[PDB]
């Protein structure tokens, strides 16, 4: 019924840091997004649990890649934004 | 071209406080699970007048908002671009 989803286009501005939850493997990275040249540069911390998408990132995607990310958004209340990745399309890969 | 669009379906769980307009959306995807709260900023006055004079608290709405997250910790900003009333409060 209710949901909060977000589409993000920008450059991967960090490395792919692997983690393991207290239970499960997941990945974390950051996306730098600047819609207007005269405007604010936005940063988003992405979380990836889907293993087929984790393998595609750590293997083929490099830092500085232009990506289109769709993520489910959650706001944990002092609020913290959570962006669990659901799909990604590589527009241009990093150097 | 970079962007960060947010799509929310939830219940307006606050009053419309004027400063531009500001309110909160209660988005609970699961009956058992957590409720997500999003502070919505509205600068579009044609949509400001629609919110105050037609929408009541607790109404189910679908909102498209642009997201901006500044790093200092981060600060999330959601500027409503368009809204559709699903069921009024």
PDB file of C-alpha atoms in Angstrom:
ATOM      1  CA  UNK A   1       0.000   0.000   0.000  1.00  0.00           C
ATOM      2  CA  UNK A   2       2.314   2.722   1.285  1.00  0.00           C
ATOM      3  CA  UNK A   3       5.854   3.042  -0.042  1.00  0.00           C
ATOM      4  CA  UNK A   4       8.756   5.444  -0.508  1.00  0.00           C
ATOM      5  CA  UNK A   5      11.021   4.818  -3.502  1.00  0.00           C
ATOM      6  CA  UNK A   6      13.780   6.934  -5.020  1.00  0.00           C
ATOM      7  CA  UNK A   7      15.465   7.135  -8.425  1.00  0.00           C
ATOM      8  CA  UNK A   8      19.021   8.509  -8.416  1.00  0.00           C
ATOM      9  CA  UNK A   9      21.346   9.466 -11.277  1.00  0.00           C
ATOM     10  CA  UNK A  10      24.883  10.475 -10.397  1.00  0.00           C
ATOM     11  CA  UNK A  11      28.501   9.459  -9.974  1.00  0.00           C
ATOM     12  CA  UNK A  12      29.695   6.787  -7.552  1.00  0.00           C
ATOM     13  CA  UNK A  13      31.864   8.882  -5.245  1.00  0.00           C
ATOM     14  CA  UNK A  14      33.275   6.171  -2.983  1.00  0.00           C
ATOM     15  CA  UNK A  15      34.508   2.584  -2.899  1.00  0.00           C
ATOM     16  CA  UNK A  16      32.415  -0.572  -2.505  1.00  0.00           C
ATOM     17  CA  UNK A  17      32.779  -1.419   1.188  1.00  0.00           C
ATOM     18  CA  UNK A  18      31.677  -4.954   2.041  1.00  0.00           C
ATOM     19  CA  UNK A  19      29.878  -5.641   5.313  1.00  0.00           C
ATOM     20  CA  UNK A  20      28.178  -8.475   7.189  1.00  0.00           C
ATOM     21  CA  UNK A  21      25.067  -7.947   9.298  1.00  0.00           C
ATOM     22  CA  UNK A  22      24.581  -9.514  12.722  1.00  0.00           C
ATOM     23  CA  UNK A  23      22.360 -12.225  11.205  1.00  0.00           C
ATOM     24  CA  UNK A  24      23.948 -11.509   6.022  1.00  0.00           C
ATOM     25  CA  UNK A  25      26.190  -9.871   3.418  1.00  0.00           C
ATOM     26  CA  UNK A  26      25.567  -6.339   2.158  1.00  0.00           C
ATOM     27  CA  UNK A  27      27.453  -3.600   0.319  1.00  0.00           C
ATOM     28  CA  UNK A  28      27.594   0.164   0.825  1.00  0.00           C
ATOM     29  CA  UNK A  29      28.639   3.043  -1.421  1.00  0.00           C
ATOM     30  CA  UNK A  30      27.928   6.728  -1.995  1.00  0.00           C
ATOM     31  CA  UNK A  31      26.448   8.571  -4.977  1.00  0.00           C
ATOM     32  CA  UNK A  32      27.261  12.211  -5.721  1.00  0.00           C
ATOM     33  CA  UNK A  33      24.471  13.989  -7.605  1.00  0.00           C
ATOM     34  CA  UNK A  34      24.433  17.598  -8.834  1.00  0.00           C
ATOM     35  CA  UNK A  35      21.281  18.479 -10.821  1.00  0.00           C
ATOM     36  CA  UNK A  36      22.205  22.099 -11.593  1.00  0.00           C
ATOM     37  CA  UNK A  37      25.650  23.606 -12.085  1.00  0.00           C
ATOM     38  CA  UNK A  38      24.601  26.594  -9.954  1.00  0.00           C
ATOM     39  CA  UNK A  39      23.077  24.324  -7.312  1.00  0.00           C
ATOM     40  CA  UNK A  40      23.675  21.836  -4.519  1.00  0.00           C
ATOM     41  CA  UNK A  41      25.680  18.629  -4.883  1.00  0.00           C
ATOM     42  CA  UNK A  42      23.744  15.804  -3.217  1.00  0.00           C
ATOM     43  CA  UNK A  43      25.206  12.677  -1.613  1.00  0.00           C
ATOM     44  CA  UNK A  44      23.332   9.454  -0.859  1.00  0.00           C
ATOM     45  CA  UNK A  45      24.509   6.359   1.016  1.00  0.00           C
ATOM     46  CA  UNK A  46      23.296   3.283  -0.873  1.00  0.00           C
ATOM     47  CA  UNK A  47      22.795  -0.152   0.684  1.00  0.00           C
ATOM     48  CA  UNK A  48      22.751  -3.303  -1.458  1.00  0.00           C
ATOM     49  CA  UNK A  49      21.483  -6.667  -0.203  1.00  0.00           C
ATOM     50  CA  UNK A  50      20.696  -8.316  -3.560  1.00  0.00           C
ATOM     51  CA  UNK A  51      23.702 -10.557  -4.216  1.00  0.00           C
ATOM     52  CA  UNK A  52      23.391 -10.550  -8.058  1.00  0.00           C
ATOM     53  CA  UNK A  53      23.666  -6.756  -7.848  1.00  0.00           C
ATOM     54  CA  UNK A  54      26.509  -6.941  -5.316  1.00  0.00           C
ATOM     55  CA  UNK A  55      28.547  -9.078  -7.718  1.00  0.00           C
ATOM     56  CA  UNK A  56      27.939  -6.682 -10.616  1.00  0.00           C
ATOM     57  CA  UNK A  57      29.237  -3.756  -8.537  1.00  0.00           C
ATOM     58  CA  UNK A  58      32.361  -5.260  -6.962  1.00  0.00           C
ATOM     59  CA  UNK A  59      33.420  -6.905 -10.238  1.00  0.00           C
ATOM     60  CA  UNK A  60      32.655  -4.498 -13.090  1.00  0.00           C
ATOM     61  CA  UNK A  61      31.738  -1.100 -11.599  1.00  0.00           C
ATOM     62  CA  UNK A  62      34.600   1.257 -10.726  1.00  0.00           C
ATOM     63  CA  UNK A  63      34.714   4.454  -8.697  1.00  0.00           C
ATOM     64  CA  UNK A  64      33.379   7.483 -10.542  1.00  0.00           C
ATOM     65  CA  UNK A  65      30.814   5.515 -12.547  1.00  0.00           C
ATOM     66  CA  UNK A  66      27.710   7.301 -13.819  1.00  0.00           C
ATOM     67  CA  UNK A  67      24.803   5.144 -12.634  1.00  0.00           C
ATOM     68  CA  UNK A  68      20.999   5.176 -12.502  1.00  0.00           C
ATOM     69  CA  UNK A  69      19.891   3.642  -9.196  1.00  0.00           C
ATOM     70  CA  UNK A  70      16.377   2.783  -8.017  1.00  0.00           C
ATOM     71  CA  UNK A  71      16.113   2.309  -4.257  1.00  0.00           C
ATOM     72  CA  UNK A  72      13.455   1.837  -1.594  1.00  0.00           C
ATOM     73  CA  UNK A  73      13.659   4.690   0.913  1.00  0.00           C
ATOM     74  CA  UNK A  74      13.198   4.363   4.675  1.00  0.00           C
ATOM     75  CA  UNK A  75      13.422   7.087   7.333  1.00  0.00           C
ATOM     76  CA  UNK A  76      14.421   5.790  10.772  1.00  0.00           C
ATOM     77  CA  UNK A  77      13.578   8.263  13.536  1.00  0.00           C
ATOM     78  CA  UNK A  78      17.138  12.497  14.637  1.00  0.00           C
ATOM     79  CA  UNK A  79      16.215  10.859  11.331  1.00  0.00           C
ATOM     80  CA  UNK A  80      18.489   8.680   9.187  1.00  0.00           C
ATOM     81  CA  UNK A  81      17.756   7.989   5.527  1.00  0.00           C
ATOM     82  CA  UNK A  82      18.122   4.420   4.250  1.00  0.00           C
ATOM     83  CA  UNK A  83      18.337   3.593   0.530  1.00  0.00           C
ATOM     84  CA  UNK A  84      18.245  -0.149  -0.164  1.00  0.00           C
ATOM     85  CA  UNK A  85      19.153  -0.654  -3.816  1.00  0.00           C
ATOM     86  CA  UNK A  86      16.707  -2.558  -6.024  1.00  0.00           C
ATOM     87  CA  UNK A  87      18.136  -2.016  -9.527  1.00  0.00           C
ATOM     88  CA  UNK A  88      21.049  -0.247 -11.195  1.00  0.00           C
ATOM     89  CA  UNK A  89      21.961   0.670 -14.776  1.00  0.00           C
ATOM     90  CA  UNK A  90      25.537   1.642 -15.653  1.00  0.00           C
ATOM     91  CA  UNK A  91      25.455   4.763 -17.821  1.00  0.00           C
ATOM     92  CA  UNK A  92      29.225   5.337 -17.981  1.00  0.00           C
ATOM     93  CA  UNK A  93      31.843   3.453 -15.989  1.00  0.00           C
ATOM     94  CA  UNK A  94      34.627   5.020 -13.969  1.00  0.00           C
ATOM     95  CA  UNK A  95      38.199   5.418 -15.156  1.00  0.00           C
TER      96      UNK A  95
ATOM     97  CA  UNK B   1      22.011  14.953 -15.972  1.00  0.00           C
ATOM     98  CA  UNK B   2      21.812  14.130 -12.275  1.00  0.00           C
ATOM     99  CA  UNK B   3      18.585  14.005 -10.279  1.00  0.00           C
ATOM    100  CA  UNK B   4      17.060  12.453  -7.159  1.00  0.00           C
ATOM    101  CA  UNK B   5      13.288  12.006  -7.444  1.00  0.00           C
ATOM    102  CA  UNK B   6      11.233  10.639  -4.558  1.00  0.00           C
ATOM    103  CA  UNK B   7       7.784   9.029  -4.828  1.00  0.00           C
ATOM    104  CA  UNK B   8       5.820   8.648  -1.585  1.00  0.00           C
ATOM    105  CA  UNK B   9       2.401   7.185  -0.811  1.00  0.00           C
ATOM    106  CA  UNK B  10       1.377   7.858   2.762  1.00  0.00           C
ATOM    107  CA  UNK B  11      -0.920   9.607   5.206  1.00  0.00           C
ATOM    108  CA  UNK B  12      -0.539  13.283   6.118  1.00  0.00           C
ATOM    109  CA  UNK B  13       0.123  12.993   9.843  1.00  0.00           C
ATOM    110  CA  UNK B  14       0.531  16.673  10.694  1.00  0.00           C
ATOM    111  CA  UNK B  15      -0.987  20.096  10.177  1.00  0.00           C
ATOM    112  CA  UNK B  16      -0.004  22.483   7.380  1.00  0.00           C
ATOM    113  CA  UNK B  17       2.398  24.918   9.059  1.00  0.00           C
ATOM    114  CA  UNK B  18       3.209  28.073   7.088  1.00  0.00           C
ATOM    115  CA  UNK B  19       6.624  29.723   7.294  1.00  0.00           C
ATOM    116  CA  UNK B  20       6.124  28.304   2.034  1.00  0.00           C
ATOM    117  CA  UNK B  21       4.355  25.277   3.523  1.00  0.00           C
ATOM    118  CA  UNK B  22       5.615  22.309   5.529  1.00  0.00           C
ATOM    119  CA  UNK B  23       4.041  19.041   6.673  1.00  0.00           C
ATOM    120  CA  UNK B  24       4.910  15.405   7.373  1.00  0.00           C
ATOM    121  CA  UNK B  25       3.883  12.169   5.655  1.00  0.00           C
ATOM    122  CA  UNK B  26       3.433   8.903   7.564  1.00  0.00           C
ATOM    123  CA  UNK B  27       4.398   6.086   5.176  1.00  0.00           C
ATOM    124  CA  UNK B  28       3.892   2.617   6.677  1.00  0.00           C
ATOM    125  CA  UNK B  29       4.526  -0.037   3.990  1.00  0.00           C
ATOM    126  CA  UNK B  30       3.744  -2.897   6.406  1.00  0.00           C
ATOM    127  CA  UNK B  31       0.889  -3.286   8.874  1.00  0.00           C
ATOM    128  CA  UNK B  32       3.354  -4.767  11.373  1.00  0.00           C
ATOM    129  CA  UNK B  33       6.488  -2.887  10.332  1.00  0.00           C
ATOM    130  CA  UNK B  34       8.022   0.551  10.749  1.00  0.00           C
ATOM    131  CA  UNK B  35       6.399   3.871   9.861  1.00  0.00           C
ATOM    132  CA  UNK B  36       8.466   6.241   7.707  1.00  0.00           C
ATOM    133  CA  UNK B  37       8.152   9.984   8.348  1.00  0.00           C
ATOM    134  CA  UNK B  38       9.088  12.470   5.622  1.00  0.00           C
ATOM    135  CA  UNK B  39       9.064  16.249   6.022  1.00  0.00           C
ATOM    136  CA  UNK B  40       7.641  17.737   2.817  1.00  0.00           C
ATOM    137  CA  UNK B  41       8.502  21.282   1.736  1.00  0.00           C
ATOM    138  CA  UNK B  42       6.100  23.028  -0.658  1.00  0.00           C
ATOM    139  CA  UNK B  43       7.091  26.224  -2.478  1.00  0.00           C
ATOM    140  CA  UNK B  44       4.549  25.953  -5.321  1.00  0.00           C
ATOM    141  CA  UNK B  45       1.753  28.259  -4.117  1.00  0.00           C
ATOM    142  CA  UNK B  46      -0.891  26.795  -6.492  1.00  0.00           C
ATOM    143  CA  UNK B  47      -0.226  23.528  -4.646  1.00  0.00           C
ATOM    144  CA  UNK B  48       0.031  25.309  -1.284  1.00  0.00           C
ATOM    145  CA  UNK B  49      -3.528  26.615  -1.616  1.00  0.00           C
ATOM    146  CA  UNK B  50      -4.685  23.140  -2.661  1.00  0.00           C
ATOM    147  CA  UNK B  51      -3.190  21.556   0.465  1.00  0.00           C
ATOM    148  CA  UNK B  52      -4.567  24.031   3.006  1.00  0.00           C
ATOM    149  CA  UNK B  53      -8.029  24.534   1.489  1.00  0.00           C
ATOM    150  CA  UNK B  54      -8.814  21.001   0.248  1.00  0.00           C
ATOM    151  CA  UNK B  55      -6.689  18.385   2.092  1.00  0.00           C
ATOM    152  CA  UNK B  56      -7.213  17.390   5.726  1.00  0.00           C
ATOM    153  CA  UNK B  57      -4.945  15.672   8.225  1.00  0.00           C
ATOM    154  CA  UNK B  58      -4.738  11.902   7.835  1.00  0.00           C
ATOM    155  CA  UNK B  59      -5.429  12.013   4.093  1.00  0.00           C
ATOM    156  CA  UNK B  60      -3.805   9.394   1.873  1.00  0.00           C
ATOM    157  CA  UNK B  61      -1.724  11.184  -0.766  1.00  0.00           C
ATOM    158  CA  UNK B  62       0.808  10.314  -3.451  1.00  0.00           C
ATOM    159  CA  UNK B  63       3.607  12.884  -3.660  1.00  0.00           C
ATOM    160  CA  UNK B  64       6.420  13.389  -6.163  1.00  0.00           C
ATOM    161  CA  UNK B  65       9.233  15.389  -4.580  1.00  0.00           C
ATOM    162  CA  UNK B  66      12.788  16.310  -5.505  1.00  0.00           C
ATOM    163  CA  UNK B  67      15.332  15.110  -2.946  1.00  0.00           C
ATOM    164  CA  UNK B  68      18.415  17.044  -1.832  1.00  0.00           C
ATOM    165  CA  UNK B  69      20.833  15.619   0.749  1.00  0.00           C
ATOM    166  CA  UNK B  70      23.570  17.976   1.961  1.00  0.00           C
ATOM    167  CA  UNK B  71      26.574  16.651   3.889  1.00  0.00           C
ATOM    168  CA  UNK B  72      28.015  18.582   6.830  1.00  0.00           C
ATOM    169  CA  UNK B  73      25.699  13.739   8.979  1.00  0.00           C
ATOM    170  CA  UNK B  74      23.288  14.661   6.193  1.00  0.00           C
ATOM    171  CA  UNK B  75      20.202  16.864   5.861  1.00  0.00           C
ATOM    172  CA  UNK B  76      17.348  15.462   3.768  1.00  0.00           C
ATOM    173  CA  UNK B  77      15.121  17.886   1.849  1.00  0.00           C
ATOM    174  CA  UNK B  78      11.945  16.967  -0.053  1.00  0.00           C
ATOM    175  CA  UNK B  79      10.423  19.694  -2.238  1.00  0.00           C
ATOM    176  CA  UNK B  80       6.971  18.636  -3.428  1.00  0.00           C
ATOM    177  CA  UNK B  81       6.601  18.993  -7.195  1.00  0.00           C
ATOM    178  CA  UNK B  82       3.172  17.393  -7.679  1.00  0.00           C
ATOM    179  CA  UNK B  83       0.545  15.673  -5.535  1.00  0.00           C
ATOM    180  CA  UNK B  84      -2.583  13.560  -6.006  1.00  0.00           C
ATOM    181  CA  UNK B  85      -5.172  13.035  -3.276  1.00  0.00           C
ATOM    182  CA  UNK B  86      -6.076   9.359  -2.997  1.00  0.00           C
ATOM    183  CA  UNK B  87      -8.469   9.587  -0.039  1.00  0.00           C
ATOM    184  CA  UNK B  88      -9.109  12.596   2.175  1.00  0.00           C
ATOM    185  CA  UNK B  89      -8.858  12.516   5.958  1.00  0.00           C
TER     186      UNK B  89
END
